[PDB]
Amino acid sequence: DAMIVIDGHGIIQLFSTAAERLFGWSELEAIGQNVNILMPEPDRSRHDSYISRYRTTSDPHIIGIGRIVTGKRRDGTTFPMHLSIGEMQSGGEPYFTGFVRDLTEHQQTQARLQEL
């Protein structure tokens, strides 16, 4: 589907093959980058605080809720995707995993039916 693992600072730790196809970064390019490289403004500039905020408050806004958001490709094109976040820990540090479902086709079908 598309899978991404980040550390508690938002740095990409793992980047699945499907993720590469979906976003247009290669694994090496992507690893060691902030996850925000995947989103547009204003979310890009806020994502760190989203993360900071959750770590302190421990109130989920998307964790085990899911949400549809706009994702951003390497070539600058944006698209809708469903996102679910999981919390994990390893070596005492927290890790987040995101499962992505590309909603591009659903949106286009819907737009196209509306337009007709």
60 preceded by a cis bond (ω within 30 of 0): no
**15 part of the interface to ligand HEM, by CB under 6 A:** no
Closest to ligand HEM by CB, 29 or 43:
43
What is the residue-wise DSSP string for 63-89? Answer: BTT-EEEEEE-TTS-EEEEEEEEEEEE
Question: Would you say 47 is a known binding-site residue?
Answer: yes
Q: Is 62 in the site for ligand HEM (CB under 6 A)?
A: yes
Order of all β-strands in the sheet with 12-15? 12-15, 3-7, 93-102, 78-90, 67-72
Candidate ranges 26-34, 39-47, 102-110; the one touching ligand HEM (CB under 6 A)? 39-47
Q: How far is CA 2 from CA 5, 23, 25, 38, 83, in A?
A: 10, 9, 12, 13, 10
Residue 39 touches ligand HEM, criterion: CB under 6 A: yes
Q: Tell me which residues in 63-102 interact with ligand HEM (CB under 6 A).
A: 63, 69-71, 83, 85, 96-98
Give the binding site for ligand HEM (CB under 6 A): 4, 6, 35, 38-39, 43, 47, 50-51, 54, 60-63, 69-71, 83, 85, 96-98
Binding residues for heme: 47
